[PDB]
């Protein structure tokens, strides 16, 4: 073992088939009596907003972390003059089902308040970008399963048809043990005929936003609470619920659908209070890890079309502590596409293809000054991108064998680049993930439009996410955002106790 | 770090791109010399039952856990009178296959014995429930691979044709890197015509039993046995092996296929016997974990069709130990569907969707009642259920273009629950999962038949599993269940050292 | 206690739902300042060979391990007389793509000298068999996604279309969240008509060989080089880079395609150097792991068609030391398939099916003699083979319903049996996977041809990874095999601390 | 009907009932036909109890 260059300690291991002797230990798994599910109905729900107020039955019963809300709906579509003619029923087999995920993609903001202190997300904007990280296949089949979940891979629905991974298709055509397309999801059709269609059935969505979870892995649930309350509020159009594919759109211009009407009925909310065993006691005061996500958008001009390039820069945005990570991407601008039921229904949620990023921390100019666009797709994947290199930089050259119509090109969805802040960006001496505060950040990346058909006005985004502890001791909830001392983030002993692979799990 | 509401300890770990220093030892992996595999041919195989006896090469051998049996078969179908025609070829491309898993669904029971003490899980029924449960896609493409294993997901084959996820499809049409359909299994067809078919082949099955694992993890193999012996008994019906879609049959319940005859030849099992290094000694008395499964059933003789709901009580059952975990699924009941070749060959293995399951403990009444079928699906995907929410509570719409024939619904698959008691049942203090004191349960559950065409008569199953240690020593095998004493569950010190996500991989 | 003498220890773990006390420690993640990536364009790249010279900035700046090289390319074709004609575009919708992975398959060898001492791995023949091995579904969509990736299942491209997993096909037809067929990759198509076609893109390639990677699973990167240099040499033929399917070509028959010219444009590597922070200091000399990939090959004069079997009887190859792993397969021979192009493009890379393997490793002289050909597959899969058993030993029955054309069999690739040395082959006591000695092995295996059309002329392969540590201390790089000694290997005390799946990860 | 108690300090009285407005259309099959009496008959027609 020694005798080669440096000497090294020697150790031996056992091929797994035979331990055989090692100390065997019998382990009993304790769990407090009375795990029960209590469904609260909504107090004071409205078309554009819902409200709940749920009290854990008693102080000292731990409430688990996964929660969700089921909301029954309805819809009616109507044929409009004068799309040149309509033959056949408005809804088609492979043409249309919900956007993914339907309820939250309409939500403006979701605020929840716990033990008297409020904690909010901004759901409408974050989710599609947040959704690609970092669901392994196993976990897209996990809890994700409840709402429709197939992310829109295609840059314009029209071209999707008629394909095997067409994002909105019938349950058949899914290949065995995979993600089923959005059109698989079930609901009644009261009636469906030319000139009119009515449809109805109850659909679930998970509450997102920390400390509530939506992933593989469980964790210790909040207790001891005295209050809770979950206020939604949904942005005003409500046409973004449904999807469409423009193949069926009339040749000159117009659509079959305009216009549509959406309901909701009282929606319940499902949570689970687990009281614990008398003998084992639970601390008087206790601390949970809580993240806190923010968005910053900046629209740019002029629009680029049909597939040309340009550059964009952002004004300096100053933050209060290094965020855990920072997402970036360039979406088709919202100010456009909120015209018309038609546009809102037809258009997909995919980004524009980043051909190079250059960003700058205060006092460092040109981080990743000349990093391969492709090399950006290298990390993450490292933080969990989970979609082939072809999705990233999406354009697929597909050719046809006949004389002599030229071969058509498909836009395939741009990328969303995420750099973990301490690890990938690089960071000065005596600074760390939750230290405070006040550094400036400015990012100038360049984008190519890929989408063939439409002239796309663009827009940039940034997302931050902050590491933060939150102590909740009944009755109150002080949550601090700078939890590490500058002089104690320098000179902390290192440790090979925990592998950095382990931290990859605890996420939000 | 401190300066929080509570002071917390600090440690620093580095990003993985540079460790870079630590004490990195070299490591020799030393497992015993002389591995080998024998092919024991079965003395006294008949048409009803197979039976082998296998003794280890000698003392000082550790038999490895993975065991499997291979068995050359032969089948002749014959066209029946007088559905004719009958035009075209008996057997079609994506209409016929084996049923998955074949030689396991036919066999009644599989008793083996170690050192004189007989362990034995009866196979029929149980396999179909367990198969779905613990396997993910990485495991499925491992050993599980040998037998046909694309488990049925269409309420009836009739509609199944011909989507890219048809359970009995040809190997072409299964996406790359997914579960392939049952018609991909090599069998060589000496002839296929109208009025005649004959197929020769050999097929592998994985002995399923408590001691053996059938999943990829490998753990110490049974040392140190002197004798071993297997025993399979096949049900006399034996036509259950083949599966065959409805579509071709007609005009009215006339199926082409009736009736075939199946023979077998000379089945042989394979065991792998390692012998450990002479230097390193193995203890004279070892203790393995040993799980014991046993299914209780009550069939009620009522019918419901095609989509009505109702409810039934499973009926009292007394027990001495609380099981580790318990499954509960209402399936289509076999007293019907065994008469006629017709029913026997074409009816798929799926179960009925559940609306609400409500269990009652001993004197509890009780319990877990108020949990939406939606919430019932949360646990488990937590112990690994591996299907979407779509397949569970399975019934899905399909849209229909052209005017004005109505859109048609498609039944998908049944939902099969499972709740490890301590984790999901809730339990009175002093009662770990696997002690011994007297208590009894009954389970009542509402259910709906979702399949579209046949009157289906239900029944129930409750499959419990008990934990205990089986101590193998030379020469004998004591088995103990309820190894903990009731006083001992109180006053057992909690260890943070072990974690719960580990115990999911120790199953089971 | 107790109750299972020998009585065992009892520890009680908590439910995952509730802890709720244990040491919550805030973990400051820290990695040194200023990561940066720089693209190294080659000077003296030529169409036949190309080579880059790229040192790190200084000593004491850790160099990352994943490196990759992108190469812009230009290809034109010409219509081949006298199959003509010949209607339709040369290229076809799903009859043509890149062979995967392209750059490596065409390149004869590749040498990357570290800190002055050269390390090289013939790349042309090794990669195809090593590829199938260590890649899960997660990783296939991870880094490796960058080049065309989808591997060959069918034995003759001719048959496969139109199949949902036919390896060359447009993006549509590929189901969601899976390995996509090689057609979907990008290439600007400038002109395509009968009698010509011109195409150009920029295609990526990971550099392969140790210490670089690969499966990430990122690890401690190389520090501290002073110089680093890469050369590739590319086989003269160069036509091997394209694919094609036999279906298009004429009956006799001539191929529609011959001939074609390929070029390159500046092609450039990409590698990023972190630099460490002032607080934490990195050692003067550090030791990495490192493996080498030998290849030994022997070919036989006897041919066998269309689907008959025989045996060999491999030439004795003598091995320098016990090697970590061995892969041994029988492929179609390289002597043929380098003449006349048509076959050279048409032929796929799949192996032949193994019926019995029996090899004389260490005076045992019978090894795996009587182990069922199925059994090898399973034991190998314990090493990650990631392909369903059906495809290993590939031959598949597919029948039809038209009276009365005979059913046809498809050839489906063979397997590549691999056997880790301590775990599978067994070793005389006193032998470990590192230890230097002098022994030689001679394989002896039967093989059956499966593909229906061509007369295969077979040949053997045997690949092995040696194990040893390499120590980089500027400016030096002594590498050593056989680091542990024989007196040392025996007597080495075994740990229970580290386990075995850990030793599964550090593969390279 | 998902309804919430007003204060949770107010006892809820035990008798509860619902009311459903409803609408039926009858029509005659041919044959039996015909038929010459009103499709609803003075003494031969009612709701089943309790409907």
UniProtKB/Swiss-Prot annotation, chain D:
Location relative to the cell: Virion
Its biological purpose: May self assemble to form an icosahedral capsid. Most abundant protein in the virion.
Protein name: Putative capsid protein V20
Part of the intact protein present: 52 to 102 of 595
């Amino acid at each position: 073992m020694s005798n080669s260059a440096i000497p090294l300690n020697v150790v031996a291991v056992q091929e797994p088939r035979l331990e055989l002797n090692n100390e065997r230990t019998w382990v009993v798994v304790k769990g407090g009596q009375q795990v029960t599910y209590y469904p609260f109905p909504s107090t004071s729900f409205s078309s554009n907003q819902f409200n709940f107020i749920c009290n854990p039955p008693s102080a000292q019963t731990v409430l688990d972390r996964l929660v969700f809300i089921q909301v029954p709906y309805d819809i009616t579509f109507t044929a409009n003059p004068s799309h040149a003619g309509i033959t056949e029923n408005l809804l088609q087999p492979g043409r249309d089902a919900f956007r993914a995920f339907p309820i939250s993609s309409i939500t403006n903001t979701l605020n929840a308040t716990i033990n008297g202190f409020p904690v909010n997300i901004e759901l409408a904007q974050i989710i599609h970008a947040l959704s690609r990280y970092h669901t392994p296949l196993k976990v897209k089949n996990g809890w994700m399963s409840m709402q429709p979940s197939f992310e829109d891979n295609y840059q314009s629905y029209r071209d999707a048809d008629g394909a095997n991974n067409n994002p909105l298709g019938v349950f058949t055509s899914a290949a065995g043990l995979s993600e089923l397309p959005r059109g698989s999801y079930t609901m009644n059709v009261v009636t469906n005929t030319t000139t009119t269609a009515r449809i109805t059935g109850v659909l679930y969505e998970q509450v997102f936003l920390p400390p509530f979870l939506w992933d593989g892995e469980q964790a210790g649930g909040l207790a001891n609470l005295t209050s809770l309350t979950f206020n939604w509020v949904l942005n005003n159009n409500l046409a973004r619920i449904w999807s469409h594919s423009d193949i069926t759109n009339d040749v000159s211009g117009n659509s079959t659908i305009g216009s549509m009407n959406i309901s909701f009925q009282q929606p319940s909310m499902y949570l689970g209070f687990v009281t614990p065993r008398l003998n084992i006691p639970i601390p008087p005061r206790i601390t949970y890890p809580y993240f806190k996500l923010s968005r910053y958008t900046t629209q740019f001009q002029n629009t680029l079309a049909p597939n040309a390039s340009s550059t964009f820069k952002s004004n300096v945005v100053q933050l209060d502590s290094i965020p855990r990570k920072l997402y970036l991407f360039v979406k088709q601008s919202d100010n456009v596409i909120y015209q018309n039921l038609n546009n809102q229904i037809t258009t997909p949620d995919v980004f524009l293809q980043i051909n190079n990023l250059n960003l700058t921390w205060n006092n460092q100019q040109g981080i990743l000054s000349g990093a391969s666009s492709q090399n950006l797709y290298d990390f993450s994947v490292q933080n969990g991108y989970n979609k082939t290199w072809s999705e990233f930089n999406g354009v697929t050259q597909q050719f046809n064998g006949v004389s002599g119509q030229p071969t058509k090109v498909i836009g395939l969805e741009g990328g969303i680049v995420c750099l973990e802040l301490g690890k990938d960006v690089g960071l000065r001496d005596d600074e760390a993930e939750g230290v405070i505060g006040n550094f400036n950040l400015q990012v100038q990346m360049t984008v190519t439009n890929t989408n063939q058909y439409v002239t796309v006005t663009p827009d940039m985004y940034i997302v931050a996410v902050y590491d933060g502890t939150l102590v909740i001791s009944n009755t109150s909830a002080m949550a601090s955002i700078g939890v590490a001392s500058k002089e104690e983030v320098l000179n902390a002993r290192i440790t090979h106790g925990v592998s950095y692979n382990e931290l990859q799990r605890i996420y939000g």
